């Protein structure tokens, strides 16, 4: 995993 | 359908008496699909070549900026990617190049990207990619595009200010933010800063390698091992293997490096990792969804601050249909 700090939103619209 | 406004936006209307661009109505006017007048674009773009050409090949800031993939012209989709990153108004942008060709609204992309760099050039940085040329806005459409909207007036000023747009940046002094990727010729910055900005990308160099430089065919799974190979599937350039960025890093003490040349499903992908630090060699970014409008991939914009590493994923936006060449 990484280090340091690290974050993720969600998608706009699932495809698959 | 909407129908585009025949009302040329004026100087005095875009700019106000204090000289500042108004983003707001530039933004509002070119959602309808609206066009400034040949005096005012051409002011925007000699104003920001004036800006870029006073700054570096490889800028060294540290602070909290998103970093955005190519865009292609496609300014439909820039509206939605600051929606989703935030306003440019009080959040830093960064973009790696290749705002033209593929899209048929490079010039929406070129003149708002300028006139926000010229509201703040402080906030956003805008860097030159291997489609910031004249050779390739000849053979695409963005030549003709300009001549169909403006004139070769406009064109011939886009080409003189894109070769005043920096090459790379260093982001907190640990990133290195580039378009296409390390170069054999450079292996030290300031193999970078002996390099020449203010002029055409040659078909092949260290310039040219860094705008079109890309990862080996199997960055992940190597069998021979090899650190520079000839581009044969760019057709150009040479391909770096996770052996050589490793050791280009190391040697710059450099922490990832942030770009972009490559589309992706997801709007971004991560290489193969440091053996020391749990942190990614190479990452890819791109903020162009729906590829070729035909590909339905996502688009992505990469955001680091306070030592945290945001990634926003975005879906294609709506546009008006085109036809090949403008035939």
């Known amino acids: 995993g990484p280090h340091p700090v690290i974050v993720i ?3 706009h619209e699932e495809l698959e | 359908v909407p129908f585009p406004p025949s009302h040329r936006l004026t100087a005095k209307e875009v700019f106000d008496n204090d000289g500042k661009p108004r983003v707001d109505i530039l933004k509002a006017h070119l959602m309808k699909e609206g066009r400034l007048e040949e005096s005012v674009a051409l ?4 104003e920001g070549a004036s800006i870029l050409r006073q700054e570096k090949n490889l800028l060294d800031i540290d602070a909290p900026v998103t970093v955005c993939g190519d865009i292609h012209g496609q300014f439909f989709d ?6 989703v990153g935030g306003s440019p108004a009080n959040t830093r942008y960064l973009f790696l190049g290749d705002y033209v060709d593929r899209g048929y609204f490079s010039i929406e992309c070129v003149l708002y990207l ?9 906030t956003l940085f805008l860097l030159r990619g291997n489609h910031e040329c004249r050779h390739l806005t000849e053979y695409f459409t963005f030549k003709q595009e300009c001549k169909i909207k403006y004139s070769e007036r406009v064109y011939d000023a886009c080409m003189d200010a894109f070769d005043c747009l920096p ?3 260093l982001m907190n002094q640990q990133f290195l933010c580039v378009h296409g990727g390390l170069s054999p010729e450079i292996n030290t910055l300031d193999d970078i800063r002996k390099l020449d900005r203010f002029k055409e990308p040659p078909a092949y160099g260290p310039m040219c390698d860094i705008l079109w430089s890309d990862p080996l065919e199997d960055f992940g799974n190597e069998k021979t091992q090899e650190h520079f190979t000839h581009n044969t599937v760019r057709g150009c350039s040479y391909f770096y293997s996770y052996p050589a960025v490793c050791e280009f890093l190391q040697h ?3 922490l990832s490096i942030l770009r972009a040349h490559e589309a992706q499903d997801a709007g971004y992908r991560m290489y193969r990792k440091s053996q020391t630090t749990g942190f990614p060699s190479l990452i890819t970014i791109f903020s162009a969804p729906n590829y070729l409008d035909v590909y339905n991939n996502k688009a992505a914009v990469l955001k680091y601050e306070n030592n945290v590493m945001n990634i926003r994923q975005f879906n294609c936006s709506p546009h008006p249909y085109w036809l090949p060449n403008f035939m």
């Open chain 2, 78 to 83: 820039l509206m939605k990617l600051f929606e």
């Open chain 2, 252 to 254: 710059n003490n450099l």
């Open chain 2, 114 to 122: 300028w006139a926000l760099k010229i509201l703040y050039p402080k």
């Open chain 1, 9 to 11: 939103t969600g998608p």
């Open chain 2, 43 to 46: 002011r925007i773009i000699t």
């Open chain 2, 167 to 169: 090459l790379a940046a």
